Amino acid sequence: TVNLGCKLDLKTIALRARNAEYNPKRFAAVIMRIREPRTTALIFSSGKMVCTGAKSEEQSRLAARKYARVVQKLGFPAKFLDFKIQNMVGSCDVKFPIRLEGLVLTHQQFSSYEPELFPGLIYRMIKPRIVLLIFVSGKVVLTGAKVRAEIYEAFENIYPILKGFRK
DNA sequence: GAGTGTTCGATCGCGACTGAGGACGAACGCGCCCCCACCCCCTTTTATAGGCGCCCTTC
């Protein structure tokens, strides 16, 4: 997310934009998209914006910066004030099946799973405060990160354990 | 002689006295609607897997 440093009129923005959507009856912000960034932006009336879809923090920064220019180019005093990363998402495959029953048993304090709920096991690591999603096929997803290393780190801690839980 | 005026007794009207009944109200009572307070609710992307609804076709 980033602040454009000014209050804006989304109605005008929606009107001007060639590739954005807005509906106050659905949400108070303009939804804008770009084919170059392929993430989508959320333009609050407050001037706050959200960048999504980006594969990297820079690309998020690049798109958000790219988003901030055109809003300015609409006629607004947009800025790049207070830019920050809000979330990062990662994924990987351990390439081997594991006995979740043992895993949810041995790490109930952190690991969490319910086959009646969702097919993926939810691991909430606190070390670097990371959440992992662990699936019967061995696929894993990590999110809630603001640092890429934490995904690598959270995964470095969890993979050996998983190997120790090989079927 | 005779006629008129006054007062206690007696007689009658009055109101006081006591209770019950009817109507009224005020304290008590009931509940809704008002509002502030506290905190959820909505959206996207990216990844995944289980369950699943609807349609198309065939019976």
Residue A57 is which amino acid?
E
Which residues of A define the annotated binding site for DNA?
A: 33, 48, 87, 124
Last residue of a domain, one of A85, A108, A134: A85
- The string of DSSP letters for A2-25 reads EE-SS---HHHHHHH-SSEE--TT
Closest C-alpha among A143, A141, A134, A128 to residue A162 = A134
Q: Which nucleotide is nearest to A38 (CA to C1')?
A: B45
First to last CA, chain A: 42
Instruction: In whole angstroms, give the CA distance from residue A167 to residue A157.
Output: 19
What method did the depositors use to determine the structure?
Answer: cryo-EM
Closest C-alpha among A27, A2, A30, A28 to residue A17 = A30
A79 and A90 both lie in a single domain: no
Domain total of chain A: 2
> Which residues form the domain of A167?
86-167
Q: Which residue has the tokens 């009129």?
A: A9
Instruction: In whole angstroms, give the CA distance from residue A68 to residue A5.
Output: 10
A6 and A76 both lie in a single domain: yes
Cβ of residue A11 lies below 7 Å from strand B: no
Residue A152: CB atoms within 10 A of its CB come to 15
CATH number of the structural domain spanning residue A24? 3.30.310.10
Instruction: In whole angstroms, give the CA distance from residue A145 to residue A131.
Output: 8
- Alpha-carbon distances, residue A16 vs A19, A74, A89 (angstroms): 9, 7, 32
A26 and A48 both lie in a single domain: yes
Nucleotides of chain B in contact with protein CB (under 7 A) are: 42-50
| Header resolution in angstroms | 5.4
